[PDB]
């Protein structure tokens, strides 16, 4: 129970797919900023830690949200892609594009996909150092 729909109207929301190595987030919310059901690979998504970020486990979490959305029930959610933060400069993982596609074939209506990765303008030092990571 929620929308109190007018009759022949469409209700829209947001996705916020934060895709980063080690985890995936499908934290859907209203445009204003009131959070609806979220979920993620780590929580209800799986187990292990091995397979948090892997694109099956993102695909499982993105059905678990869209179970609820029809129920709430929204309709379609705008998708914004967040990769990772500024110092690292990392763009979204593979687990994004499986999470998006599970919402489509759930199925939930969509539109306006954006990359909202916080990139810096120069700014700060990375981890590691001069030589950086060497493994």
């Amino acid at each position: 129970l929620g929308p109190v729909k007018r009759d022949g109207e469409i209700v829209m929301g947001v996705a916020h797919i934060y895709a980063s190595k080690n985890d995936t987030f499908v934290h859907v919310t209203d445009l204003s900023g009131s959070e609806t059901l979220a979920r993620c690979t780590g929580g209800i998504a799986v187990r292990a830690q091995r397979d948090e970020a892997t694109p099956y486990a993102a695909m499982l979490a993105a059905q678990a949200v869209a179970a609820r959305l029809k129920e709430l029930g929204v309709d379609g959610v705008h998708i914004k892609f967040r990769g990772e933060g500024g110092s690292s400069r990392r763009l979204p993982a593979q687990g994004a594009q499986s999470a998006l596609r599970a919402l489509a074939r759930a199925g939930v209506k969509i539109g306006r996909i954006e990359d909202v990765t916080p990139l810096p303008h120069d700014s700060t030092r990375r981890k590691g150092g001069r030589r950086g990571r060497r493994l």
């Binding site: 109190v4 204003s32 009131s34």
Partner: protein, 219 residues
């Protein structure tokens, strides 16, 4: 679990409408309080394409602060941006990129900071791969970008501005002048951040088509 949270419609045209945009959900007003003691300056973020159902100008983005209401939330110009896809696409190598940040007051009671990005162009007779504008001929353009943008902003009120950002009127008035010096291909107006918004007066309620239900509450 979720029950008892009161959903409300969202609503100034301006450029288009299709006045209703979306439904935003907060919470029940529990006495001792107004509806406006929730929905406190929430921003929203919408393309031009959402209301007119048209491609073209799909990339441009608009934003509105939650200025007033309780029965139904009414809203006010927060600013503009591009989609990050579009802004990224414009940049090219082997060309002189040109910027111009302008602090500019409107005819009405906003204060704005506008931005822009403009590139040089090769054309016809030049065979070389890279054309670079001179420091002087780049600084000539920044004067043209400021002067056109600051004058066109200053003269007109803010509904005309927000129409002209869709119509790309100010874009074309720049390339007029540049033909004389540097051709400059590209030219987009990127951002306009609202620094100092007008406070909610009863004259502004009469302008923006905000109902009697709102100004009873939030004043």
């Amino acid at each position: 679990s979720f029950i008892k949270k009161e959903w409300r419609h969202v609503m100034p045209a301006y450029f288009t409408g299709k006045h209703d945009i979306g439904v935003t959900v907060s919470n029940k007003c529990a006495r001792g309080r107004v509806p406006m003691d929730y929905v406190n300056n929430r921003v929203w973020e919408l393309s031009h394409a959402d209301m007119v159902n048209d491609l073209s100008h799909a990339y441009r983005l608009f934003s509105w602060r939650s200025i007033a209401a309780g029965s139904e939330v009414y809203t006010q110009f927060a600013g503009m941006r591009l989609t990050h896809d579009k802004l990224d696409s414009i940049m090219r190598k082997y060309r002189t990129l040109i910027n111009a940040s302008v602090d500019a007051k409107t005819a009405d009671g906003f204060i704005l900071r506008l931005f822009t990005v403009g590139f040089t162009k090769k054309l016809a007779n030049s065979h070389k791969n890279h054309t670079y504008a001179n420091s002087h001929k780049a600084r000539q353009v920044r004067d043209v970008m400021v002067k056109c943008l600051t004058d066109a902003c200053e003269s007109n009120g803010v509904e005309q501005l927000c129409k002209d950002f869709v119509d790309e009127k100010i874009e074309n008035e720049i390339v007029e002048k540049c033909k004389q010096i540097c051709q400059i291909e590209g030219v987009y107006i990127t951002k306009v951040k609202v620094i100092k918004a007008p406070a909610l007066s009863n004259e502004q309620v009469k302008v923006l088509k905000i109902s009697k239900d709102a100004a009873q509450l939030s004043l």
